């Protein structure tokens, strides 16, 4: 009874440290999840029944995703290696179901967040300043590690409390996150996290309402627009780095980063228009480029990429209407389950559930924004981490919302 609670508490404490710092932390954490579910045998038959208002839109939405994503193979005879990455999105079901049975103490989750962020900062500092490395990621890919760091920092931004020390810890969370990201380059993730943290000031300070966020974003936008009045500072001449690219893309020459990205997006969204329901197939995006009439007349870099770099374009082109709906659902259904728990916690007082729901919503927003520039489905580490975190936060969120 109690032992499951204590071990689940220490596991949620150590999850960020295991994932970020420990090299093979994904396997260790997936073993920690298993050594909990294997302990409650007659449980979880009366735990699905208790939280079927939250569990079911985390099980049906993933089962439909898997079914639609494997129902492409019956005709599009691509090998099974494609569906080995979506085999890792089923882990969200398990990591939510285990938490639902074994009630944790999410007071330690935030302490784990800050400990993991500080230790990851130390590791990255060592790997950049001494063992000279261009892309100092701990033990995974640089982009996947950047996504991990952004998600951890945004979760930790929702510290429950209103006090000097709690605000200090919340601010240090984003400070460490931005230091880690800047040491790893990939400033796109930095700007995504910065724009995602602005709506989270709703959860951060429980005094600044919707108007005290609207005014803030208006001021920030005006400050940003103030740059072009004097186009000398680096602020003007980095968003002016793509003006030439787009104006050239509108002309004949398309051999630039923005130009290549837009050309791939158009060659994806025209094929999707030609094949509304089903596309080339699951994965297999290279067939569009290899069979188009643009790559037949030129050998630009856009004709050799394995997959597109836009989730809303890659999913639509490869799968089609059902695939686009299920891919959208995989992110939006959690976004609808977090709101329904946040409002319940708000109606119950219970600030911890409110902050947890805010953290979950921020994670969903950050995942969508990151997917607006890259395909998060390709990286196995990104997929497994997102599934684990989205199934772990909503577990305690539902636990706090109900009782």
């Amino acid at each position, epitope marked *: 009874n109690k032992l499951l609670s204590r071990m689940a508490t220490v596991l949620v404490f150590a999850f960020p440290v295991l994932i970020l710092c420990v090299p093979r932390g994904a396997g260790v954490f997936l073993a920690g999840v298993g050594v909990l579910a294997l302990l409650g045998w007659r449980g979880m038959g009366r735990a699905w029944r208790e939280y079927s208002k939250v569990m079911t839109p985390l099980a049906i939405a993933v089962l439909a995703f898997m079914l639609v994503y494997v129902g492409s193979k019956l005709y599009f005879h691509t090998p099974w290696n494609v569906i080995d990455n979506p085999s890792r999105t089923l882990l969200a079901i398990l990591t939510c179901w285990v938490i639902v049975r074994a009630a944790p103490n999410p007071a330690w989750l935030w302490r784990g967040i800050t400990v993991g962020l500080f230790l990851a900062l130390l590791i990255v500092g060592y790997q950049k300043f001494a*063992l*000279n*490395i*261009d*892309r100092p990621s701990a033990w995974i*890919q*640089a*982009i996947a590690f950047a996504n991990m760091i952004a998600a951890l920092a945004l979760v930790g931004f929702a510290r429950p409390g209103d006090s000097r020390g709690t605000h200090m810890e919340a601010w240090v969370n984003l400070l460490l996150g931005t230091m880690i990201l800047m040491l790893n*380059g*990939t400033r796109g993730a930095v700007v995504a996290m910065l724009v995602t943290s602005v709506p989270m000031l709703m959860i951060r300070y429980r005094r600044f309402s919707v108007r005290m966020l609207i005014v803030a974003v208006c001021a920030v936008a005006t400050l940003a627009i103030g740059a072009y009045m004097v186009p000398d500072s*680096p602020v003007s*001449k*980095r968003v002016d*780095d793509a003006v*030439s690219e787009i104006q050239m893309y509108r002309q004949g020459n398309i*051999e*630039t*980063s923005v130009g*290549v*990205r837009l050309k791939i997006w158009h060659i994806g969204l025209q094929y999707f228009s030609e094949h509304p329901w089903t596309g080339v197939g699951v994965g297999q995006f290279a067939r569009i480029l290899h069979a188009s009439e643009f790559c037949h007349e030129t*050998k*630009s*870099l856009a*004709c*050799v*990429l*394995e997959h597109a*770099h836009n989730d809303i374009v890659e999913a639509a082109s490869t799968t089609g209407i059902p695939g686009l709906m299920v891919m959208l659902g995989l992110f939006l259904v959690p976004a609808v389950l977090f709101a329904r728990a946040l409002r319940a916690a708000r109606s119950l007082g219970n600030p911890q559930g409110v902050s947890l729901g805010g953290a979950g919503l921020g994670v969903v927003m950050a995942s969508l924004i990151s997917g607006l*520039t*890259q395909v998060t489905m390709a990286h196995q580490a990104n997929v497994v981490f997102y599934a684990g975190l989205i199934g772990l936060l909503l577990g305690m969120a539902g636990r706090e919302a109900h009782s």
Partner: antibody
Amino acid sequence: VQLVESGGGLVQPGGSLRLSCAASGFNVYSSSIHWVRQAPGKGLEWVAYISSYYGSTYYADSVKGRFTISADTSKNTAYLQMNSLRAEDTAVYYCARIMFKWVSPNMAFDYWGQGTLVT
Amino acid sequence: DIQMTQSPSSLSASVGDRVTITCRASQSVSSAVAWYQQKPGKAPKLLIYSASSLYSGVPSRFSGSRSGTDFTLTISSLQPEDFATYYCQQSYYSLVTFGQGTKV
């Protein structure tokens, strides 16, 4: 998209030389420009580069302390300034540009220059 | 720093016989090794980036793969224009390094 370099020639040891790597079709402040040299009848040897936006630079073991790489976004050109050359610095010097950061998170040289010979 | 070794340093094979080239590494570079082809008195051009992805204008004969820290390149078949020197560059460490350079 073309990269051209010039400035090489005959120089006695102990002197100095500057190479200008003019670029076209892109912005030097956007991507990163790498200098690389190849000894005659030998393999390629890296020397230095500059970062995309930050301007941070790294140098090879042999050329550190005397080679000065620089960029000028006003003229969209890159320069490598060498001081106190010895006889072991005779090689053909090439320009190099990495691919886009998104297509390759790790640096990979795609567009090069014609190269110049220094002796 | 990091030392890259290539084997064989120089090998010859007739047309139609596939040839493999191995690039080793002193330390662990995850996937930041690319391959270049240099013709005599000409600027080298990129062939494979991230050790497993082809570059534009490169025929599908060229292919690379990763096995731990021992990186290998192979060609489907040899055509008369494929006889040129090859190099491997590691980009994981901020101080990049080129290999010794094999010759076909």
